[PDB]
Amino acid sequence: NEAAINQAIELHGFPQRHVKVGKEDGAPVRDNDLRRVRTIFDPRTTDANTAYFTGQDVDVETLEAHNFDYSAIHEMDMRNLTTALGLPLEAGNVGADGLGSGKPAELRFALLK
Amino acid sequence: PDPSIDEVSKSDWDALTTQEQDDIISQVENLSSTGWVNTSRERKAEAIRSAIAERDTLYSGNMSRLPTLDGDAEYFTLYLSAHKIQLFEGGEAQSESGEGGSVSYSTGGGGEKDLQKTRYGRMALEYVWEDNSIAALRTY
Amino acid sequence: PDPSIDEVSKSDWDALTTQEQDDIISQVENLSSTGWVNTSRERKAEAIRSAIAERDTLYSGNMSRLPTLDGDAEYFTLYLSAHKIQLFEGGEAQSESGEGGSVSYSTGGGGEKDLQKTRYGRMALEYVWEDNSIAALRTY
Amino acid sequence: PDPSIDEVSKSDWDALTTQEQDDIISQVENLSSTGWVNTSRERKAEAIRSAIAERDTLYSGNMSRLPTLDGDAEYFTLYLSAHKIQLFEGGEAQSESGEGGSVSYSTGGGGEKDLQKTRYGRMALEYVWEDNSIAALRTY
């Protein structure tokens, strides 16, 4: 699960840029052309205040980061692992609502003792 | 033909013997039942030379590392030649009428762009992904 | 025919005897009542050779673990041959008229793409998933 | 007929006697008031052989647990044969005109896919779920 999250964050946790070249139903672009386009919009040489100038027939589309609740996956992973190992979930750096006060707290510490 | 139409570029076509050109012309003339017999050799030669140059410049190289000419380069160049020959003559007839006898050839609207406008073009168009752009590249 | 049209590629067609080619041509001519009898042998041979090449280039391979040619490859190659022959004669007669009287063949405008433009094309089209982009692939 | 048209595959049709083929051809000829009498035997035989091959490849197997051909396979093959005896003679007559005497046959445009383009096709199409895609499958 940790490996799956680590990979998924790289693929989907970061936005990515998709340059679409040429008009819909227009003249077809070839990859020797895309080499020259890639050389312009290169993230390797782009900066925070860069501006782009084009004809109407070029689009800079965005793969928006397809957000997912990896935090809850972490809490589930930690819940399973700690409770399998017989530890309180708090030892795994994970909290819970309501259970942080009174004898509803003390019971886990009693079980540990 | 001995040198095939896919084996020759514009400069090569100019280097061929008259017979080698004529064999290729004879192959192109198979694509119409009329053989375009009322159009001169020079015009058929120019159409072929043009089709060869146009293939090599507009229908060459790659997109996404697929070849942009997917089909048989022989028949592509022949169909592109036949497209050119037909356009040297007003294009396709939607109808022909003579001494009372008449016919109509179901061509229809036929789109708007070059290869759409004649039957040989419409055949050649399947060889080159229907003029679509499947092109893709990435950062490295 | 002894070598069937699906059992040969373009290079094999060029290697066939005249009788083997003539048997295949004779089979293709069965696809029309008119037999394309006024069109010469060379033109019918060219259309067949082209259909064989076009099958092996544009209609070979796979879409998912399916073949891209689902129907019988014999009849597909024959229909593709007949499609080509009909285009060599100028396409579908939508209407004909003369001292024999007159007829109209209910084509409408039809589609835009070559196989949509003739009856043999529209028959061939069903063999090849109707030209649909049905392929799928995954990482492993 | 003794062997019915639904009892024979492509290789079986080729194994029949001329009489058994002629009985089946005679049955197909019942589907037009004209009997297609100006088209030769070889062409009617080819249309039937094609209908058999096309049935066994494009109209065979299952779509869910159901068969992809629901109706009587005899009459399906006959209509698919008649659909291929038409089209070997051009399309449907929208209109026919002789010595002044004239008729028009109310076909409409019909559609775009081959079976939509003639009445025999439009009948055969009803037997095969109207080319609908009702197939379904589960993980196990």
Next chain:
Amino acid sequence: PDPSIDEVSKSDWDALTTQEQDDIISQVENLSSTGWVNTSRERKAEAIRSAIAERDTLYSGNMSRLPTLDGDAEYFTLYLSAHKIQLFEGGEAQSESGEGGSVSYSTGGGGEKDLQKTRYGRMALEYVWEDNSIAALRTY
């Protein structure tokens, strides 16, 4: 007729005497003023046999806990037969013209599906839920 058209399946139709078939054919011929008199017996018999087989295969069984054929099966089979006979004669006359004068029969374009295309078809179509997918089923 002593055996009615709704009482016989395809196997039974083949077992009838020629007189029992002729009685049923005679009943079908009542569905047109023209009787289809210039179409031969074999063609009318084939259309009836086909209509019987098509009823029993495509227009049989249940659609919810009720029959898919709601109307009188006698008249349904007659209308389905008349539809097929009319298609064997080329379909609906939209218009007729000659030295008798001229007429137009008000059809419009009609629908797309076979039963929609002719008057006998449209009469048959009301008997069978207008070809609608009205069936329902549940888990138990």
Next chain:
Amino acid sequence: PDPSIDEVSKSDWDALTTQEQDDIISQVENLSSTGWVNTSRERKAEAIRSAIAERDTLYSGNMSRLPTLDGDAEYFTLYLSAHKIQLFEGGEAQSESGEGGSVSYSTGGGGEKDLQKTRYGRMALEYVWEDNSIAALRTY
């Protein structure tokens, strides 16, 4: 007529005397100025017998506590009979012409469905909620 057309079912029609059938036929013939005088007795009788059976099967029962046939069942069966008779001879004439005389009858498109396509059908249609699906039912 002495037994009225609304008082008889299909089995009753077969039980009537020739005169009782002829009285009902004579009543149906009142619905056209032409009387359909060139169409034989058997065909007018078959149309009536069919209309009786079709009323009793397709136009019987209830939609809520309403009858599905709201109008006068006599005139409904007559209009349904006249509809069938007209369809036994090509349907509506949009236009008729001969010897330099001509007329056109304002029929238009006339919808798509059976009863919509002729004037007698359209009269009958008003008797049967215009074929609308107005039935309602509840749990108890």
Next chain:
Amino acid sequence: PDPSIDEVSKSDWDALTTQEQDDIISQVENLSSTGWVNTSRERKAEAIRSAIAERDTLYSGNMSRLPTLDGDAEYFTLYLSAHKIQLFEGGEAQSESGEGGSVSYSTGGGGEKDLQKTRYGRMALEYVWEDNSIAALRTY
């Protein structure tokens, strides 16, 4: 030609010998079966000179460092010349009629722009990205 048509600009064309100009004209005259023989030499010279100037002004430079003229500049200039010559003769023939009989050339309406309006224009249009604005530029 010794100096081919892409080796020269407007001021070079004006400096060529009549023989060099006339050979280039002779190459342009290959692009029609009719050769534009009934249009005078000076009109063809004007169209070529105009095409040379128009190429160098309207169809020169770059878009995202791609050349604005992707195809062979020879055939582009020839097509642009032939387009202009055809416009000097009043444009396309959509249809022609006379004692030679009649013909219609399947144009449809076409596009609105000059290069869309004639066949030589449409052939030229493919060489120049179909007049699209693919240009892209950045801050540095």
Next chain:
Amino acid sequence: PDPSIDEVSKSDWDALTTQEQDDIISQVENLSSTGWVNTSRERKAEAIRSAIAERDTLYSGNMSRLPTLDGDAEYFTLYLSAHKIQLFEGGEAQSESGEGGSVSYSTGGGGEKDLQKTRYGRMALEYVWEDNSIAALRTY
């Protein structure tokens, strides 16, 4: 010509010798195969003078610090002149018919602005950004 049409303004045109004007007129007369021989000198001179004045007023100055006339000013002024000469006679010919026979040109189908109405207009239009409003300016 000695002074080129792009080297002269309206006051310069009025200052030219008759020979220099006639040279420029002769250049404009190259743009039609008919040469407009039935329209007098004064009217062609007026069209040229008008084209010069209209260039200098409506097609002068800058647009996003590009010139509003991007193409060759010689050929722009010639095409604008030819456009005016054409409009001094009528529209474009859509159809022309003689004592016998006819030709039609597909000259229509464009937009409604004056330059869109004729072939010379549609050529001139490309030289001037197709009347597009690509101008831009900023605070400083």
